[PDB]
Enzyme design. Structure first.
Site, PDB file in Angstrom:
ATOM      1  N   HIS A   1       0.721  -1.269   0.000  1.00 26.17           N
ATOM      2  CA  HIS A   1       0.000   0.000   0.000  1.00 26.17           C
ATOM      3  C   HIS A   1       0.734   1.293   0.000  1.00 26.17           C
ATOM      4  CE1 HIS A   1      -3.527  -2.436   0.508  1.00 26.17           C
ATOM      5  NE2 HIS A   1      -2.924  -3.044   1.515  1.00 26.17           N
TER       6      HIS A   1
ATOM      7  N   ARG B   1      -1.113   9.076 -12.130  1.00 25.85           N
ATOM      8  CA  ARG B   1      -1.818   8.058 -11.389  1.00 25.85           C
ATOM      9  C   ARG B   1      -2.958   7.633 -12.260  1.00 25.85           C
ATOM     10  NH1 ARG B   1      -2.017  11.888  -6.372  1.00 25.85           N
ATOM     11  NH2 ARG B   1      -3.849  10.676  -5.700  1.00 25.85           N
ATOM     12  N   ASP B   2      -2.601   7.175 -13.461  1.00 30.12           N
ATOM     13  CA  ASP B   2      -3.568   6.726 -14.463  1.00 30.12           C
ATOM     14  C   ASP B   2      -3.655   5.195 -14.516  1.00 30.12           C
ATOM     15  OD1 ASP B   2      -0.998   6.322 -15.654  1.00 30.12           O
ATOM     16  OD2 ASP B   2      -1.726   6.757 -17.666  1.00 30.12           O
TER      17      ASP B   2
ATOM     18  N   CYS C   1      -6.671   1.080  -7.432  1.00 29.85           N
ATOM     19  CA  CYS C   1      -6.627   0.289  -8.659  1.00 29.85           C
ATOM     20  C   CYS C   1      -7.678  -0.811  -8.592  1.00 29.85           C
ATOM     21  CB  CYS C   1      -5.233  -0.343  -8.838  1.00 29.85           C
ATOM     22  SG  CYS C   1      -3.845   0.841  -8.827  1.00 29.85           S
TER      23      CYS C   1
ATOM     24  N   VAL D   1      -7.383   7.767   5.898  1.00 30.01           N
ATOM     25  CA  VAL D   1      -7.412   6.334   5.704  1.00 30.01           C
ATOM     26  C   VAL D   1      -7.610   5.564   6.994  1.00 30.01           C
ATOM     27  CG1 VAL D   1      -5.886   6.610   3.691  1.00 30.01           C
ATOM     28  CG2 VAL D   1      -4.926   6.073   5.917  1.00 30.01           C
TER      29      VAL D   1
ATOM     30  N   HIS E   1      -2.252  -3.271   8.238  1.00 31.88           N
ATOM     31  CA  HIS E   1      -3.447  -3.579   7.462  1.00 31.88           C
ATOM     32  C   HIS E   1      -4.123  -2.291   6.996  1.00 31.88           C
ATOM     33  CE1 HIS E   1      -7.316  -5.602   6.508  1.00 31.88           C
ATOM     34  NE2 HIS E   1      -7.887  -4.605   7.161  1.00 31.88           N
TER      35      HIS E   1
END
Length: 123
Positions: free
Chosen positions: A13, A21-22, A81, A103, A114
């Site tokens: 992560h 960031r495509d 993604c 987050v 995690h």
């Protein structure tokens, strides 16, 4: 078994400075990070520096959350993604979604181990 859950967290992560960031970005980093044998259906990367991510484990940048999680106080640049195509076997096709928000992680021994993917399974 020791602090290896944290380094595995970084591997799965974290990406300090992504470029674009495509979609192509997703397809490439997901391959380089080995989340491609069975294609992972959704995975999110956090950008920025490690120190502030780690600090989500302290009251410095985190709050207790739900059962045993921690939610950050600050927002992070993030990229999610999502597998596109159904088939869980390569080639793994990803659609990228860049975002900016806090987050949720699980901490262990003051370290993130995690990332809760549910808040990004944005429907």
């Amino acid at each position: 078994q020791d602090n290896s859950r944290y380094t595995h967290f970084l591997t799965q992560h974290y990406d300090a400075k992504p470029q674009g960031r495509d979609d192509r970005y997703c397809e490439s980093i997901m391959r380089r990070r080995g989340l491609t044998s069975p294609c992972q259906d959704i995975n999110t990367f956090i950008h920025g520096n490690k120190r502030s991510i780690k600090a989500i484990c302290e009251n410095k940048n985190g709050n207790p959350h739900r059962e045993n999680l921690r939610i950050s106080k600050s927002s992070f640049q993030v990229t999610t993604c999502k597998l596109h195509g159904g088939s869980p076997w390569p080639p793994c096709q990803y659609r990228a979604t860049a975002g900016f928000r806090n987050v949720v992680v699980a901490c262990e021994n003051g370290l993130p181990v995690h990332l809760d993917q549910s808040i990004f399974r944005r429907p």
